[PDB]
Design a protein around this nucleic acid. Structure first.
Ligand SMILES: CC(C)[C@@H](O)[C@H](O)C(=O)NP(=O)(O)OC[C@@H]1C[C@H](O)[C@H](n2cnc3c(N)ncnc32)O1
Ligand SMILES: [Mg+2]
Ligand SMILES: [Mg+2]
Ligand SMILES: [Mg+2]
Ligand SMILES: [Mg+2]
Ligand SMILES: [Mg+2]
Ligand SMILES: [Zn+2]
Length: 860
RNA sequence: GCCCGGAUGGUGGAAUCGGUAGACACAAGGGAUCCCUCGGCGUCGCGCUGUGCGGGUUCAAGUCCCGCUCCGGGCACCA
């Protein structure tokens, strides 16, 4: 053993050993309890960043821990390889997306290997390969045939010049990120999967997920947004079509004083034929961008349509207004307004002079003051004809029943959750296996024509997808007739929704899943990812799991028993605007920055002299060029130091503002462990430890080793606070460095301790541990060593520390036999001069005794 | 705007079930790879104060409640 710890002479040697022994390659071994430890697969943007490093270290820590408990652990890795970033990057770099992606995969695979994550490389998948996506295509066709897929018109950001569909990220201030002109909404026919058919199940099964955090379960409930209400239909006077609204507040219905209607509503359109203010307004609205955040912050605006709906119950004509905040796609395109009791409606009505009609009494039974704002509280009705005096429940029911009897209303369940738009009009994605025949009929691509392969050998131009530009490509024949294949491609969450199941049988050719292998490994025991994916991805993932259950592909109702959503790793993000409009994102490594007394960035320049817009600390990201690559730290300090640092900096669930400073802590600590092992083992073999004949000083030390094993075990296995586990190991290491090591018992004890420390560290820093384990003459390779177990007999204590407070303020700390009464603790407490000092002249009014821990004498 | 989080020393963080605030480290300063000091203010072998800010509940709040400021995640085409 070398005196000096040299990660360059260790890490690659140990990685080579795992590659060659196939250490982490697993099969469906029925002799072992499985454990499936899954980390959210990487998108191959080119480099890892520290967000990746935290995700996969947490996951590797757990997979190694579970292996040491004797489990057969599948920890798989793969690439979520389709998507937008490959398209811009290929244009700019004069490549195609495929070759760019596969190069990023190779680079990034090498970085993963160099961090030493124990992945089963034999199960490596890339989602952009037809061996993968053929299965989701077949599955889609089966989903369409079972009536779970439909086509409708949906809004897309449209650049009228380039004639491109843009993602929201590419829309910058309602103008493009290429040339400059106003992006507009274009309604476009697209495919949707009826995730709403599973809304209730998705909502309800949250109650089974006892090992998913409440943050994620609440965000998902609120996203699905299930509601119980009433749909109501209105006639409109010089108009041949009815108008339907949904409300969850039918009780306030007599207070409905106007309807609002989406700029694109046929009623608005008709009215626009005879009204120039209106026409101009509808046309302003085509440049309302599709993004809920923008819908909800924009100044709310309306023009009167001149049409009047008839309130079904009161009979009065109420105005129909066209509004910039109501969308045709997200319901019936019409909403009803109750400005007396909805603050948003109140604001609109105040702005426009519409009737604000009160129908709920104030808390005292008087008519409410609506001069400043709405009375939003549920209450007793008045000014509501036959419904006066009813409360919320009863008014809901009475008004619902009446409208139903009249044939203009029905009780309806509503969800905020919309169906899943899975169409994209980009090239770099899996082709949607649908076809239009010469006939005009549309159908799934026939089975013998699956997969529909995306050609990878392409010339890109940024504007048009090659499969859309090549005329021949879409041509096929179906039912003996000419047909055109769909040139849209799948939303990439399609591939990431089922990868976890495909990792169980990635080389299986006869079907999407080998259910035998799927049912050995599933469900995922723990799914490690960022909080970023708490909603969209996790919901889609749960849904897809239920879809496959309903195809009889899987046993479980849910895909993942436990979920560990780490906080995001953040880094400062910067950009300057390029001379033709476009944001150029500069790495924080390259920004020159001046800082506040509070640490806040206050000026920011790139080295080229550009003035950088500082956007804040935000998730390390492919898109914002703010991802910090670990390569240089791994090369300087070693993978083990980087991994320990990441696990040490913060507990997984906190969000982390990345900084390199602090690494010296991990690195120096690893050098101390190395030194201690070196010094111990330079001395040779140890005698068997004689427990019954230990000193008190030796007993004490042995207690702390075992107390450290128990705590570390709890911290990793129950709390997932890795940072505190590592701190416990450091504390123990600090005691062990001051332990004498002359005698045989002292050395026997140090052997036991070090064998314990090196195993407890192995998940975090496995290359050094693998090596040290050998120096200690541990049995076998550490990857297979049992996790140390604490012995209860070694950690008994007859004494306990009691803090003594007077009036909540610590005045003494005393040691107290564990059998001590309160009365004896009092007396012992009285013996301390700093307790007597605050008791002289006063009366103890109340004693609080937390047995074995605290005495608060409340005095005066 | 809406949903979910968050704020503890110069810095990352610890306090797990309401019970010693600042473990463990980094950085910096001092002393000889190691030891020391290290929130702030002032009988220091003492005392007061202090967990973003404003209030509550409680013998007791970093923890629970209400509110405010600032900050992150998501908001359906970033993945
Ligand atoms: C499962 C699927 C939808 C995702 O995995 C998607 O392919 C993706 O996001 N890939 P990624 O950005 O490479 O990052 C891979 C994972 C996702 C997870 O949130 C984590 N991650 C990504 N970025 C961060 C980050 N900044 N902080 C903390 N964690 C981060 O690594
Ligand atoms: Mg902090
Ligand atoms: Mg602070
Ligand atoms: Mg306390
Ligand atoms: Mg102090
Ligand atoms: Mg405070
Ligand atoms: Zn443009």
């Amino acid at each position: 053993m070398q005196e000096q710890y040299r990660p360059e002479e260790i890490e690659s040697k140990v990685q080579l050993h795992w590659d060659e022994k196939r250490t982490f390659e697993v099969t469906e071994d029925e002799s072992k309890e499985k454990y499936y430890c899954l980390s959210m697969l990487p998108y191959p943007s080119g480099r890892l960043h520290m967000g990746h490093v935290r995700n996969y270290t947490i996951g590797d820590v757990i997979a190694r821990y579970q292996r040491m408990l004797g489990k057969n652990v599948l920890q798989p890795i793969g690439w979520d390889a389709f998507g937008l970033p490959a398209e811009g990057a290929a244009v700019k770099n004069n490549t195609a997306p495929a070759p760019w992606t596969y190069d990023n995969i190779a680079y990034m695979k090498n970085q993963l290997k160099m961090l030493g994550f124990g992945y089963d490389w034999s199960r490596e998948l890339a989602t952009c390969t037809p061996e993968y996506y053929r299965w989701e295509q077949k599955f889609f066709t089966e989903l369409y045939k079972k009536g779970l897929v439909y086509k409708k018109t949906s809004a897309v950001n449209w650049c009228p010049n380039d004639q491109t569909v843009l993602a929201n990220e590419q829309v910058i201030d309602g103008c493009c990120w290429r040339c400059d002109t106003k992006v507009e909404r274009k309604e476009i026919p697209q495919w949707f999967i009826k995730i709403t058919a599973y809304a209730d199940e998705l909502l309800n099964d949250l109650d089974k997920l006892d090992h998913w955090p409440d943050t994620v379960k609440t965000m998902q409930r609120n996203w699905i947004g299930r509601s119980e209400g009433v749909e109501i239909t209105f006639n409109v006077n010089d108009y041949d079509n009815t108008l339907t609204v949904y409300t969850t507040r039918p009780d306030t219905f007599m207070g409905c004083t106007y309807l609002a209607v989406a700029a694109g509503h046929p009623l608005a359109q008709k009215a626009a034929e005879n009204n120039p203010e209106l026409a101009a307004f509808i046309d302003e609205c085509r440049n309302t961008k599709v993004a809920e955040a923008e819908m909800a912050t924009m100044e709310k605006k309306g023009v009167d349509t001149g049409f009047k709906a008839v309130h079904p119950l009161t009979g009065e004509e109420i105005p129909v207004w066209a509004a910039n905040f109501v969308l045709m796609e997200y319901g019936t395109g019409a909403v009803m307004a109750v400005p007396g009791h909805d603050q948003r409606d109140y604001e609109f009505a105040s702005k426009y002079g519409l009737n604000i009609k009160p129908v709920i009494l104030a808390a005292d039974g008087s008519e409410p003051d609506l001069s400043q704002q709405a009375l939003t509280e549920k209450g007793v009705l008045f000014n509501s004809g036959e419904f006066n005096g009813l409360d919320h429940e009863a008014a809901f029911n009475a008004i619902a029943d009446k409208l139903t009897a009249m044939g203009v209303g029905e009780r309806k369940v509503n969800y905020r959750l919309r169906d899943w738009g899975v169409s994209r009009q980009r090239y770099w994605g899996a082709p949607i296996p649908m076809v239009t025949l010469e006939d005009g009929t549309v159908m799934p691509t026939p089975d013998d024509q699956l997969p529909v392969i995306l050609p990878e050998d392409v010339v890109m131009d940024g504007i048009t997808s090659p499969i859309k530009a090549d005329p021949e490509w879409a041509k096929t024949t179906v039912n003996g007739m000419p047909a055109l294949r769909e040139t849209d491609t799948f939303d990439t969450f399609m591939e990431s929704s089922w990868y976890y199941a495909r990792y169980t049988c990635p080389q299986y050719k006869e079907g999407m899943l080998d259910s035998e292998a799927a049912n050995y490994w599933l469900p995922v025991d723990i799914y490690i990812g960022g909080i970023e994916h708490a909603i969209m991805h996790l919901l889609y993932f749960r849904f897809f799991h239920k879809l496959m259950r309903d195809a009889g592909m899987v046993n479980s109702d849910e895909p993942a028993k436990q979920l560990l959503c780490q906080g995001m790793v953040l880094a400062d993000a910067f950009y300057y605007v390029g001379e033709n409009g476009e944001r150029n994102w500069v790495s924080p490594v390259d920004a020159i920055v001046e800082r506040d007394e509070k640490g806040r960035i206050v000026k920011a320049k790139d080295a080229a002299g550009h003035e950088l817009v500082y956007t804040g600390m935000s998730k390390m990201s492919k898109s914002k060029n703010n991802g910090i690559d670990p390569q240089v730290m791994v090369e300087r300090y070693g993978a083990d130091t980087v991994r320990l640092f990441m696990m040490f900096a913060s507990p997984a669930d906190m969000t982390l503002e990345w900084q390199e400073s602090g690494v010296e802590g991990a690195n120096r600590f690893l050098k101390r462990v190395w030194k201690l092992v070196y010094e111990h083992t330079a001395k040779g073999d140890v005698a068997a430890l004689n427990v019954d004949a230990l000193t008190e000083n030796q007993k004490a030390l042995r207690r702390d080793v075992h107390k450290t094993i128990a705590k570390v075990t709890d911290d990793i296995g129950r709390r997932q606070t890795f940072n505190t586990a590592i701190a416990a190991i450091m504390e123990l290491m600090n005691k062990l460095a001051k332990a004498p090591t002359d005698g045989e018992q002292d050395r026997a004890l140090m052997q036991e301790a070090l064998l314990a420390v090196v195993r407890m560290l192995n998940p975090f820093t496995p290359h050094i541990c693998f090596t040290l384990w050998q120096e200690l003459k541990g049995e076998g390779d550490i990857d297979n060593a049992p996790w140390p177990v604490a012995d209860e007999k070694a950690m008994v204590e007859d004494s306990t520390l009691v803090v003594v407070q007077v009036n909540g303020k610590v005045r003494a700390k005393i040691t107290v036999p564990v059998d001590a009464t309160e009365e004896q603790v009092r007396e012992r407490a009285g013996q301390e001069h700093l307790v007597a000092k605050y008791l002289d002249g006063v009366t103890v009014r109340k004693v609080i005794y937390v047995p074995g821990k605290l005495l608060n004498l409340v005095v005066g």
